[PDB]
Symmetry: C2
Subunit: 298 residues, 2 copies
Amino acid sequence: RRAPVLGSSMAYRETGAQDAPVVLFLHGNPTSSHIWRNILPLVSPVAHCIAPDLIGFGQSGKPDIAYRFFDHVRYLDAFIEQRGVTSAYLVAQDWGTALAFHLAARRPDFVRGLAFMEFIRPMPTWQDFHHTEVAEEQDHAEAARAVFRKFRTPGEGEAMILEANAFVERVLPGGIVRKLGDEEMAPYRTPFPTPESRRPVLAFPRELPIAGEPADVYEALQSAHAALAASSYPKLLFTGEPGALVSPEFAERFAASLTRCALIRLGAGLHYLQEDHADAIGRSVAGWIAGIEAVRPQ
Amino acid sequence: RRAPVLGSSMAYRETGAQDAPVVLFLHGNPTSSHIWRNILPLVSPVAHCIAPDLIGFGQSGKPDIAYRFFDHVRYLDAFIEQRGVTSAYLVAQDWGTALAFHLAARRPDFVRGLAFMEFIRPMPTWQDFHHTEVAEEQDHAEAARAVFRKFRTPGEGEAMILEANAFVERVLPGGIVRKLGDEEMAPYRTPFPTPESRRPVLAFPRELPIAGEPADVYEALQSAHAALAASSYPKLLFTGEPGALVSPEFAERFAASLTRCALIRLGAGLHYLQEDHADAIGRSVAGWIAGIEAVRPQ
Ligand SMILES: [Cl-]
Ligand SMILES: [Cl-]
């Protein structure tokens, strides 16, 4: 499906009933609603599932904008408005979680519950990016820091992401335990056939809140995380082992620090947890919605 | 662990933080808490899990009793009382569901929620045993009816179940889609080394509420089903295809007739759904409990 949004368009996948609660599925970099393809059918029995492609991603429009975090904020807000969604569960990964947290902070009453994984938080130092404390994960964590430092460097970032397509070709498969089939990988490639098309994919790592910068995003996410910590709505945190942005020991501590946040351990997993754990995530989210709906207002 | 119950004892598996809500896992014929072994670890993070072995099953005592449905009721009540459990979620399959429905009918305030599958219901005619409307299933359903009619026949039942051990050796593996490993099958055999020890296994099919008989169980399960249909507590129904006691079409209609009952389709499955869907069931139940607990007292 397609929705007109701010003079452009956003593509979205939709499934479920009509009178069911809405669940918005929010992808990150460099994915699209494609990543939820095997999860949607497991949640559709209990909810009206809506999975937008972020502006510049998947089958959405490609306007000549900056593709900064606040650009995605604006386009997602306009999409929510266009679709007439007045409240929803949020299910999110990667930059999807930053969008979810910021949305929940501004509109606390909108959120029925938040299910999240491999999420973004303000990172005081580069050592906080891919922070982990177990064996051969440090090789992988340090490399991830080196690659992302370069992504954030003028000229270098352009060469890696726009020219060499490294986020699609390396980082993505790098964050999935199993090897995708050709037919599963192809829809990740099709939105990005050219250097210019890859502008949003380069913009996102330059938005990551690291060592206080970019300051506008860093401050907004500090604020969003304060609101999350004070929030009362149901939460579900998924973690893989060793994970990427979120290590198991951190996940445990983080979930315990919040109000009403359950921790679900998935097993072997990196960044793109949906591709290795579609069944487990789908079944968990579906049970969770069913339980909340069974005791919610009525 | 072991608890003294009515002059005998019941074995039970226990896992999870003991300040968490309790979940009681109730197995049926001819199984034990063994059947939950791959589900417990998935529910443990959100609940204090208690999985008893029914009297005469698993590692429980083998007292000199009839092992009728109401013997199980009395022993399970006495177990719950001994453990000091004042409310619980219930997760149940087979005769476990009959005990669950009956407990819920008598003590609905005890029931935090009920997750169930392949459940027993009053069956007016033998055609309601393994009831199916699907052409290709009719042969299988008729074969099932033929064996259970024999189990219920004086003399013949004893030869099949006590002498030849057919419930353990044929019925159990017959209701699992995969083939259990030798190490997974062994603990299903060890409770039943002798014809004498198999008395509870023979008692159960003779308790099934078919064509009005035995009248006590039939009437109790008639009332319990009316209670279930009116009940307001959260419920989850799991189904397999084709299932055994519950067909997919029936599950759908049944779930829809209930209040606050979500339907979870597992895919290919017969009667002992835990052995084929441990991860899906565990993940769903854990999510459901997490969701209910997040919205409870507040
Ligand atoms: Cl990024
Ligand atoms: Cl039986």
